[PDB]
Amino acid sequence: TLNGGITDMLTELANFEKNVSQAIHKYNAYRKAASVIAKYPHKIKSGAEAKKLPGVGTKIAEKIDEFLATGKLRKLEKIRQDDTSSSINFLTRVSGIGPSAARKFVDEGIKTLEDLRKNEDKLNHHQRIGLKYFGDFEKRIPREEMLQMQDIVLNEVKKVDSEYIATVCGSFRRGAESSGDMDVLLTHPSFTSESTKQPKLLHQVVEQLQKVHFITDTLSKGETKFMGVCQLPSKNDEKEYPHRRIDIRLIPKDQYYCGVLYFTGSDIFNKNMRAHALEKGFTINEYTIRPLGVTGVAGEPLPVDSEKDIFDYIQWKYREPKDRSE
DNA sequence: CCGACAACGCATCAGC
DNA sequence: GCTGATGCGC
DNA sequence: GTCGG
Ligand SMILES: O=c1ccn([C@H]2C[C@H](O)[C@@H](COP(=O)(O)NP(=O)(O)OP(=O)(O)O)O2)c(=O)[nH]1
Ligand SMILES: [Cl-]
Ligand SMILES: [Cl-]
Ligand SMILES: [Mg+2]
Ligand SMILES: [Mg+2]
Ligand code: NA
Ligand code: NA
Known part of the structure; x- marks a missing residue:
């Protein structure tokens, strides 16, 4: 957590692009950077030093420079201001409510914990239970x-x-x-x-x-x-x-x-390992790892008998569970 | 540049 | 009902 | 938003 401020700044930006912008890639981009920057064993001194890690390009490099200089990012102060975005972000915390349903509820005029409680009749089973344990799930x-x-x-x-x-x-x-x-x-x-x-x-x-x-x-x-x-x-x-x-x-x-x-994750570790599997030429899911022929189409399952076997197929040294948290 | 970005189970709805 | 697209959370 | 062909 040498760079808690930055990684936190990035996460917020990621949540903003996800919930509000519905730009799922910009979201993942930020998550990846937040991650790579989180495992980085040094306290980032400048954007330049960060743009060295894979996942941190120009745009994120500049924001980190803006954040290191003033302790904050104007683009977020603004978002924190915009009332519509603030509601969407809050509604997305109720389990079962994604960006779509949030923006929807906001339009209907439901934008606070209260509004949701007096409109329980407009929530599906999942959202209902999620609101019920709103607090609990936050813990x-x-x-x-x-x-x-x-x-x-x-x-x-x-x-x-x-x-x-x-x-x-x-x-x-x-x-x-x-x-x-x-x-x-x-x-x-x-x-x-x-x-x-x-x-x-x-x-x-x-x-x-x-x-x-x-x-x-x-x-x-x-x-x-x-x-x-x-x-x-x-x-x-x-x-x-x-x-x-x-x-x-x-x-x-x-x-x-x-x-x-x-199921051991992290989700980012999987996204990375599966990405890398695709470059090595394979495809991995929670069921099997299959090779990729020119046609692109996945082949037949390869023989696996250890988590380590999967790592080898893609030529990746085995990493312990504890080291997969990204 | 510019196409790709992990992969999938379950709930809900549209169209037939 | 069934299929396929979209939503949501892994 | 970032990146590899
Ligand atoms: O998008 C996702 C989400 C989850 N996963 C995997 C990794 C994750 O560890 C596992 C269980 O999901 P959780 O949401 O429980 N995440 P995790 O347990 O790692 O962290 P947390 O402590 O938040 O639950 O499913 C993915 O592969 N892709
Ligand atoms: Cl900020
Ligand atoms: Cl499969
Ligand atoms: Mg979990
Ligand atoms: Mg879970
Ligand atoms: Na970089
Ligand atoms: Na949510």
Whole structure:
């Protein structure tokens, strides 16, 4: 965090292009730069020094110069002023509300926490639940609490079928001191890239996780992807823990490594590794890594048996989870 | 220059 | 209902 | 917004 001010400045600009400008590339551009500049082991002295890192070009170099000189960026002061942009940015914090729905609500005249609460009838299931736990979701989860949640999720899963193997991924597997949510990868010998010898494999787990009042709400639920809410149980006369976001992703057991790699992130690390895979000539997803022929079309899955195998295919030295946080 | 930028599950809606 | 585009969050 | 052919 030698450059917290700059990386923070960049993130804001990224969120602005995303939520307000709906310019998804300008968004990612800024994120990448914020990232590269965040791993940079030196306290940037000037824009020039930054334009050396890949991801920081001219435009971002100048802003960093403007920020180092005055401790701020005029382009952001302005945005912070513009009322329409400020509303859109705030509405985009309610889970389930993207740039489109925000700008939409603003037009309808809904632009504050209050407006949303008196118009609950205009929110879909996801947005509704998101507003419900607006505050809670703003809070981070301490690793200590992540460990507790992990026991529950794993012991319960073991309860449904000792065949289930549940791995907590995300910022947790990358060993963070806190997480924005909990991400769980689930496998079961019955479900492979070859056959689903059992249905409701995911359903079963969510059902058990709901019986013990661990899962409290649902944002979306598919045959292999659950997006919901959970809560650590409290003791007598003990203030309740905040409600937490939990993702559950069921992946074919023979494709675990590609799946664990994906769900371990970071999202930027994946975006980079997948970009680099495409240059090396391959394509990677949470399922498999396939080669690319001249036609461009993806080939057949390559034999993977370790996260490291994927790294090799693309000629990238293996990086530990902790070193994938970008 | 200028085309590309990671990849995909689930919810919601339009058009048939 | 089904397919495909768009939205939203991984 | 940045970058590699
Ligand atoms: O756009 C995305 C988002 C997420 N992911 C992967 C990486 C990420 O770590 C994982 C789970 O997503 P989260 O939103 O949970 N991010 P992460 O757990 O890394 O951080 P946080 O602590 O915010 O949850 O999914 C992508 O590949 N692309
Ligand atoms: Cl600023
Ligand atoms: Cl695939
Ligand atoms: Mg997470
Ligand atoms: Mg998540
Ligand atoms: Na650069
Ligand atoms: Na949002």
